[PDB]
Design a protein around this ligand. Structure first.
Ligand SMILES: [Hg+2]
Ligand SMILES: [Hg+2]
Ligand SMILES: [Hg+2]
Ligand SMILES: [Hg+2]
Ligand SMILES: [Hg+2]
Ligand SMILES: [Hg+2]
Ligand SMILES: [Hg+2]
Ligand SMILES: [Hg+2]
Ligand SMILES: [Hg+2]
Ligand SMILES: [Hg+2]
Ligand SMILES: [Hg+2]
Length: 243
């Protein structure tokens, strides 16, 4: 028989875990080969070749069906598994509603620092930044900068995000890791600037922050369950979209 089949597809907000089963005990596997394609597309691409029986597929479009197949070697490759189609799950990124100092768009994904007083950080409505996602913000409008400005991700909704157990950028391009500024800076944000967060596997994560065609990579040590994101601006007029 074709010696391997896909046994589990674990669909998550930031990707898909594919796990396969050797379905013929008499086969001796040296290597496995996993391929994928968008169901809209007509060409498979290798994503994993190796001896493990699972692979975490990241950086796929939510909403979108992909098809996966796997074979094995143990020399020529074996016939393919039956294909299996999966998709990442959809959990939309939204700002908290009802937080004093911020006004939201209809779909709750654009926040504006208005003229009211504000308690502190405007957090995401829940911890919806998941392992494997690319989290993207865009600055729609600006106001006066202040070093209490931040945009970032953090482990708990705590009563700026320049503090422990968070990573964030300020509006001058400075980057903070658990409250401590890094040497390397990004360009200051202007209207139209995007800020992107990518994170890679206590716990040590390696964070890539990209903004205005520059990036900085560094290690983040926290105590990868889902994260909050947040923003804080001291002066009015700043407006940020999260994708
Ligand atoms: Hg099995
Ligand atoms: Hg199995
Ligand atoms: Hg298995
Ligand atoms: Hg399909
Ligand atoms: Hg094959
Ligand atoms: Hg993940
Ligand atoms: Hg937090
Ligand atoms: Hg932050
Ligand atoms: Hg910050
Ligand atoms: Hg995490
Ligand atoms: Hg912000």
């Amino acid at each position: 028989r074709p010696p391997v089949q896909i046994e589990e597809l674990i669909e998550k907000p930031g990707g898909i875990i594919v796990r396969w089963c050797k379905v013929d005990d008499d086969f001796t596997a040296q290597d496995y080969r996993l391929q994928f394609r968008k169901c809209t597309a007509n060409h498979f691409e290798d994503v994993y070749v190796g001896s493990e029986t699972e692979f975490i597929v990241l950086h796929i479009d939510p909403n979108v069906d992909y098809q996966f197949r796997v074979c094995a070697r143990g020399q020529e490759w074996s016939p393919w598994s039956v294909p299996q189609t999966g998709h990442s799950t959809l959990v939309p990124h939204e700002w908290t509603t009802g937080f004093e100092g911020y006004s939201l768009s209809s779909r709750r994904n654009i926040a504006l620092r208005n003229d009211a007083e504000s308690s502190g950080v405007l957090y995401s409505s829940a911890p919806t930044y998941f392992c494997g996602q690319t989290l993207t913000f865009r600055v729609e409008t600006v106001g006066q900068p202040d070093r209490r400005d931040s945009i970032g991700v953090c482990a708990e909704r705590q009563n700026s995000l320049q503090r422990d157990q968070a990573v964030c950028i300020s509006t001058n391009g400075a980057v903070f890791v658990n409250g401590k500024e890094m040497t390397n800076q990004l360009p200051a944000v202007t209207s139209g600037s995007t800020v992107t967060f990518d994170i890679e596997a206590n716990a040590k994560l390696r964070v890539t922050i990209s903004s205005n065609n520059r990036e900085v990579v560094f290690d983040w040590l926290l105590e990868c369950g889902p994260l909050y994101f947040g923003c804080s601006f001291f002066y009015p007029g700043w407006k940020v979209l999260v994708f």
